[PDB]
Ligand binder design. Sequence first.
Ligand SMILES: OC[C@H]1O[C@H](O[C@H]2[C@H](O)[C@@H](O)[C@@H](O[C@H]3[C@H](O)[C@@H](O)[C@@H](O[C@H]4[C@H](O)[C@@H](O)[C@@H](O[C@H]5[C@H](O)[C@@H](O)[C@@H](O[C@H]6[C@H](O)[C@@H](O)[C@@H](O[C@H]7[C@H](O)[C@@H](O)[C@@H](O[C@H]8[C@H](O)[C@@H](O)[C@@H](O)O[C@@H]8CO)O[C@@H]7CO)O[C@@H]6CO)O[C@@H]5CO)O[C@@H]4CO)O[C@@H]3CO)O[C@@H]2CO)[C@H](O)[C@@H](O)[C@@H]1O
Ligand SMILES: OC[C@H]1O[C@H](O[C@H]2[C@H](O)[C@@H](O)[C@@H](O[C@H]3[C@H](O)[C@@H](O)[C@@H](O[C@H]4[C@H](O)[C@@H](O)[C@@H](O[C@H]5[C@H](O)[C@@H](O)[C@@H](O[C@H]6[C@H](O)[C@@H](O)[C@@H](O[C@H]7[C@H](O)[C@@H](O)[C@@H](O[C@H]8[C@H](O)[C@@H](O)[C@@H](O)O[C@@H]8CO)O[C@@H]7CO)O[C@@H]6CO)O[C@@H]5CO)O[C@@H]4CO)O[C@@H]3CO)O[C@@H]2CO)[C@H](O)[C@@H](O)[C@@H]1O
Ligand SMILES: OC[C@H]1O[C@H](O[C@H]2[C@H](O)[C@@H](O)[C@@H](O[C@H]3[C@H](O)[C@@H](O)[C@@H](O[C@H]4[C@H](O)[C@@H](O)[C@@H](O[C@H]5[C@H](O)[C@@H](O)[C@@H](O)O[C@@H]5CO)O[C@@H]4CO)O[C@@H]3CO)O[C@@H]2CO)[C@H](O)[C@@H](O)[C@@H]1O
Ligand SMILES: OC[C@H]1O[C@H](O[C@H]2[C@H](O)[C@@H](O)[C@@H](O[C@H]3[C@H](O)[C@@H](O)[C@@H](O[C@H]4[C@H](O)[C@@H](O)[C@@H](O[C@H]5[C@H](O)[C@@H](O)[C@@H](O)O[C@@H]5CO)O[C@@H]4CO)O[C@@H]3CO)O[C@@H]2CO)[C@H](O)[C@@H](O)[C@@H]1O
Lengths: 649, 649
Amino acid sequence: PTVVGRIPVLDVRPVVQRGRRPAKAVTGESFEVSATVFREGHDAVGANVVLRDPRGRPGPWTPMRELAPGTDRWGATVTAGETGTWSYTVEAWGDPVTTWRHHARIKIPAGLDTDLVLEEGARLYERAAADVPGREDRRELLAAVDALRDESRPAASRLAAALTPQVDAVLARHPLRDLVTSSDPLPLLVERERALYGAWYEFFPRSEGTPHTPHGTFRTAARRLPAIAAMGFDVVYLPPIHPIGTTHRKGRNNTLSATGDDVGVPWAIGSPEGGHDSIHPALGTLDDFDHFVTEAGKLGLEIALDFALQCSPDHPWVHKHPEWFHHRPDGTIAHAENPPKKYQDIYPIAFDADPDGLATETVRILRHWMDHGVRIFRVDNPHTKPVAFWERVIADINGTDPDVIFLAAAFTRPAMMATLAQIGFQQSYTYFTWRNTKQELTEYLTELSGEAASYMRPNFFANTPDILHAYLQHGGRPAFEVRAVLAATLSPTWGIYSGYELCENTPLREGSEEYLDSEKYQLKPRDWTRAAREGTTIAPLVTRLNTIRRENPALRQLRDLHFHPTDKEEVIAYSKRQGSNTVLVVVNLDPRHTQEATVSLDMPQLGLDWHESVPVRDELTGETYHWGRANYVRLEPGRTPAHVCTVLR
Amino acid sequence: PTVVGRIPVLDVRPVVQRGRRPAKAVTGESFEVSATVFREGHDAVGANVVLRDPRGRPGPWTPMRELAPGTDRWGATVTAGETGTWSYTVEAWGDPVTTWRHHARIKIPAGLDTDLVLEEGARLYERAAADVPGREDRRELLAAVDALRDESRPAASRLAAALTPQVDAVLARHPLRDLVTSSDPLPLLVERERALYGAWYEFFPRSEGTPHTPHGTFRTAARRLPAIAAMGFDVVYLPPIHPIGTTHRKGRNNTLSATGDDVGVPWAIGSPEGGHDSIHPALGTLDDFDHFVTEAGKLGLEIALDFALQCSPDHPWVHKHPEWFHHRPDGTIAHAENPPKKYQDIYPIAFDADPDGLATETVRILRHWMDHGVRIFRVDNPHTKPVAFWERVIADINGTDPDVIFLAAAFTRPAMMATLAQIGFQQSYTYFTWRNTKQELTEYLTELSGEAASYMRPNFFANTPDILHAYLQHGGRPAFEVRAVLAATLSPTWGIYSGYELCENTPLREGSEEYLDSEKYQLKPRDWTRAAREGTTIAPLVTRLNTIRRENPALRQLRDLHFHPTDKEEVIAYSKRQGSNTVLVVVNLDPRHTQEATVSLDMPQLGLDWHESVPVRDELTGETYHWGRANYVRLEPGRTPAHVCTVLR
Ligand SMILES: OC[C@H]1O[C@H](O[C@H]2[C@H](O)[C@@H](O)[C@@H](O[C@H]3[C@H](O)[C@@H](O)[C@@H](O[C@H]4[C@H](O)[C@@H](O)[C@@H](O[C@H]5[C@H](O)[C@@H](O)[C@@H](O[C@H]6[C@H](O)[C@@H](O)[C@@H](O[C@H]7[C@H](O)[C@@H](O)[C@@H](O[C@H]8[C@H](O)[C@@H](O)[C@@H](O)O[C@@H]8CO)O[C@@H]7CO)O[C@@H]6CO)O[C@@H]5CO)O[C@@H]4CO)O[C@@H]3CO)O[C@@H]2CO)[C@H](O)[C@@H](O)[C@@H]1O
Ligand SMILES: OC[C@H]1O[C@H](O[C@H]2[C@H](O)[C@@H](O)[C@@H](O[C@H]3[C@H](O)[C@@H](O)[C@@H](O[C@H]4[C@H](O)[C@@H](O)[C@@H](O[C@H]5[C@H](O)[C@@H](O)[C@@H](O[C@H]6[C@H](O)[C@@H](O)[C@@H](O[C@H]7[C@H](O)[C@@H](O)[C@@H](O[C@H]8[C@H](O)[C@@H](O)[C@@H](O)O[C@@H]8CO)O[C@@H]7CO)O[C@@H]6CO)O[C@@H]5CO)O[C@@H]4CO)O[C@@H]3CO)O[C@@H]2CO)[C@H](O)[C@@H](O)[C@@H]1O
Ligand SMILES: OC[C@H]1O[C@H](O[C@H]2[C@H](O)[C@@H](O)[C@@H](O[C@H]3[C@H](O)[C@@H](O)[C@@H](O[C@H]4[C@H](O)[C@@H](O)[C@@H](O[C@H]5[C@H](O)[C@@H](O)[C@@H](O)O[C@@H]5CO)O[C@@H]4CO)O[C@@H]3CO)O[C@@H]2CO)[C@H](O)[C@@H](O)[C@@H]1O
Ligand SMILES: OC[C@H]1O[C@H](O[C@H]2[C@H](O)[C@@H](O)[C@@H](O[C@H]3[C@H](O)[C@@H](O)[C@@H](O[C@H]4[C@H](O)[C@@H](O)[C@@H](O[C@H]5[C@H](O)[C@@H](O)[C@@H](O)O[C@@H]5CO)O[C@@H]4CO)O[C@@H]3CO)O[C@@H]2CO)[C@H](O)[C@@H](O)[C@@H]1O
């Protein structure tokens, strides 16, 4: 054998860990398959992509084209259908017909060996007619052959009866392919839509209580579901819903000692009342939780539970499974860390005494919540448990229930982030919150929509309970408006944590990214009705952004994204496309000062002529503009954070 | 079974075609094995490279280090030994001792759990002690244990007894590795020194004739070998030495019809007198060729024959193997093309009718010349024959005779260039002659000495019989000096085509890269004795450059190469190192004007202090300067084309 085939087809992308892990897509998503294709000598090559479904059935005729001249890099867009494990192949081939046309264009006019050239022609077109399975098509070609060999017609007459648009059509569909050479198949995992596209809202059920009973239940917190659905959200992420430990319970504002009333941190999971398969008694029963899930579902909301593989000192596991913890010479267990942060209320799990026991128990727990309608898990600190443990766990869960989605909350270095996504995590948190300037956003979104999109699906939370960026702190409401526009338009999945709507931005101290009086360590009742009444919420903008995403397919995908130059540091501009839907966004990143700029659009990228003018509608205002290659914009913080425009087609 | 191991070790490099083709090296050559290595949580990792020889014998302990902070990318240098197929593997592991130290360096001056910390170290050093081979080493580790355990001593002195330089050495040589995890082995092909390092000289034997017999023989051409070996060359590249066709034979200066005594083009191989297994009858007999080869060897020169797989119309193959050519509808064979260069004197070979017979015959022809001591083949136009043909042919020949070296004369696009080298070509012609400015040289050499060094070895011909670059046309002798120093010092393999010495630079016409009165179409007698008598030759400089190369191991390798800044655009600087040998080179690229500039060196990159001084010797002159951080140079065309300095230590 030989590594290289007759016509070289090499370095097929996408590829993840050299073929050992699947590339990713979701139902309905288009992406580029590419390859290096070329041949010996000067004759033309062609190439096509053969995408195959889980039962092995090939997709449609999908020809490729060289992506830039002289590079020998070929590409074509493919689209994924039903969920499951697909494969894709690039077929490369000599294209004698393009070759002969190239020569027949020059030699026939300038006079050289004409009878010979046309007869070389007729034999190609005759070989073309055999592989063609339709009879009306086949006759269209045998007409060109007889016209090529008809020596009573002059030279340019016999030539041009082979170069009609009528014949182009047949050969564009069934071309003559020499020396078909095939790459080895690469794997593609196609998952459900929600893996890539959705809006997420995080809240603490315990905060939504009553005057007589401050600690909310599932029954009381259900009253927020209608409002969350009215904002356009699809997923509700709940922090841990299990009993909370008492030993070393943290107090308000992350203090070491709890008072009597203090509720502790949901992440300090476990007490005598139960562990990860239990409900905090103050939240209600498993029955109340089913009713919450049922109400959520009737409003089009899925529930995502936090899975945090750690324990308070009171978790049953501490006595039932001591071997799942590292003990020091004196018997004690070191509390968890993530420096310079210390988690004095919890123990980390050790995996090397009993990995099998731990995988078995973990998938048992997940299967429990899956039985009760939870098909999404937000996995806490996955980067502090082994990578292979998650690879096993996710493989096991998806083996039986491929619809389950796991989101890696991996705020960590790039290698681990990438690796977690590559071993099966459906979505990932990202560096979004720490990308605020134009350069930062452009660089990073260029990275996420590029190569990374074959293994990572980003979830852009503009805030979290642990992340209030200095941009939001210093810039106030105009800043919240900017980051929501940015989050919802740059990623097909975005989210907020309750209170973002109210522009809560008081930090614990200057230089921190923690909230003052954080909800992690206390009940936090909010006057939602008063904020609506007095207009001190951005819930309308949030609602509007989700409607725009729901109405424009371009915003429900990731990979088609392009940045257009403006002439101000503070004004950034980008576009996204999907079929006939084009969305064009311009954002002022200055939350204190009005900016005016000229956005110089890159018209070929919008599928347009440079000299063209096209109507757009700002979906944030309903106002219509006429824009082309060079457009004045004026953006005033408070009043207009951005223009979010559809191209009227 | 998980793809990912316990301690992730990922994306091991070098790698060629995803592990389906070997990376390359030569005996004595050092290169970097790298990998992405990290683990879950905050604890430290270590890693090492296990290079295995062709019998499986592992190499020495070879620990890696993180190459830049926060990247998780680790590397170490390895050195290839005897020839054959080797393998390499990266081992990654938990480094508990480093982890304990970082925790203890903090927790002991604090006072936080000191008896408990020091017992944890004692127990680690106990484990470390068990795995050590040496008696003296195990005693040193068990001493540090008792010092850690001695509760009557203060905390800082118990710890200090485990942090000594004496213990550090033991553990760096024999460390305690948790959870050892291995990459899958990658293949390395190790070839003879000559594949990477050597000086090449091309000449046409027929031009070394007599007054009474103008057409040179192998007997007369042997008398040119001593001057070639005195110039310090290692290889003699001869154009095709076979009989030459008469049908469509070309005349002088590439005209279509030859006169009665025109000698034709050597590459138009074949007459009734023989094919690629025969000697041109004007060159002598097979026996004369053996005498020639022997005379070459006696002077330390190896012979490289041109292998051009093509035919004159009079080549026996035309009638014997008709299926080895492409025939038009009238039975005529179209002459070869490489547009706009027409080759009217030859036919190209077609490969898809009888590939087995073509391969069989090609290896037979190659084996014939190998029986007569030809161990190197300069393969003409490899990019016009199928890639898989050369893969097959090279695999065949190297399977019995691994010392045979194939050099790819592929002046073509990047993707084919690279692919040829990756499928087995030991050496590759390059874009060197079209890289004349500082920006061009730096960019290209950065490319050739980085990632492509794992599959391609460059041969820098400053000229060929097809390439007289304008730099040399417009530059005169000073330009010949510049390009010779550049070629000899930037690649461990370089060469020249005869006449380069004499500063032959008249082109066929303005804007061509062909020689006037090109030696391809005529006898080109050269009065070597006269040019030496008169000094109209750079043979002294050539001798000197090769001698410098023979005495500085830095110039006999490719991959260690760094460029240092200068403030003139016309002056380029670079260093190369190998063990304790370091060669600094500064070249004036201006052939017409005298140039002065400040060379600002990158002193860390030479293994030196920023505030350091170092004695250098320009080996071109014998002069000695004292250079440091910033250095004045004055380079005068004619007198001083460059400085080629060594570092005296
Ligand atoms: O009851 C228990 C418990 O409950 C709660 O706690 C829980 C939380 O509620 C829960 O959500 C969860 O949160 C924790 C989370 O899981 C942890 O991972 C942890 O994350 C935080 C980090 O600890 C913290 O440091 C920070 O980190 C982020 C940085 O601040 C950002 O700036 C950002 O940094 C990344 C860069 O953006 C990115 O570019 C890349 O950087 C690389 C560079 O590009 C590259 O050049 C190179 O840099 C070099 C330089 O070039 C060189 O010159 C020189 O300076 O070195 C550098 C590098 O050393 O390399 C760079 C890579 O290193 O990557 C950067 C990533 O490092 O992102 C950082 C990470 O996202 O914020 C994190 C998020 O908050 O802590 C979370 C909070 O606890 O789990 C908790 C436990 O269950 C309560 O809160 C508790 O009180 C309670 O006890
Ligand atoms: O008896 C028979 C016969 O005998 C003799 O002939 C024989 C000879 O004696 C023998 O030695 C042998 O020689 C021939 C050789 O084998 C042939 O291949 C042929 O080679 C010559 C070429 O025909 C000729 O064109 C030329 O080519 C070189 C260029 O001049 C250089 O400029 C250089 O170009 C390369 C670039 O340097 C490099 O960067 C790369 O460029 C790519 C870019 O990097 C990339 O960005 C992209 O560019 C885009 C741009 O982005 C875009 O904006 C826009 O501009 O488009 C471009 C792309 O179009 O892509 C670029 C390309 O992919 O590659 C460039 C080249 O591809 O290098 C060129 C090649 O090295 O010189 C060649 C060397 O001579 O001809 C030789 C001579 O015949 O075999 C002969 C046959 O046996 C006698 O001589 C005969 O008379 C006799 O009949
Ligand atoms: O298209 C979306 C846009 O629609 C509406 O804009 C209209 C404007 O309200 C209206 O005034 C008009 O725009 C005129 C503008 O009135 C006029 O003054 C002139 O603008 C000048 C600035 O006055 C001048 O300071 C300077 O400003 C920038 C410059 O743009 C920038 O390129 C760089 O050089 O810095 C300068 C200083 O910061 O130059 C500009 C012109 O380049 O010309 C404008 C041309 O139209 O008409 C607009 C509709 O066509 C909405 O009001 C607005 O909110 C929406 O964004
Ligand atoms: O190191 C290799 C070098 O060694 C020997 O050079 C020595 C000289 O022979 C010796 O005279 C001395 O050099 C003096 C120089 O004579 C003196 O004129 C001065 O040079 C000035 C220039 O006059 C001035 O035009 C300017 O030149 C450059 C500048 O360097 C550059 O950075 C940029 O700004 O462009 C300018 C315009 O061309 O500045 C320089 C000084 O920076 O000072 C020199 C100080 O050394 O010492 C030399 C070192 O030993 C050999 O003789 C010589 O052949 C070798 O090349």
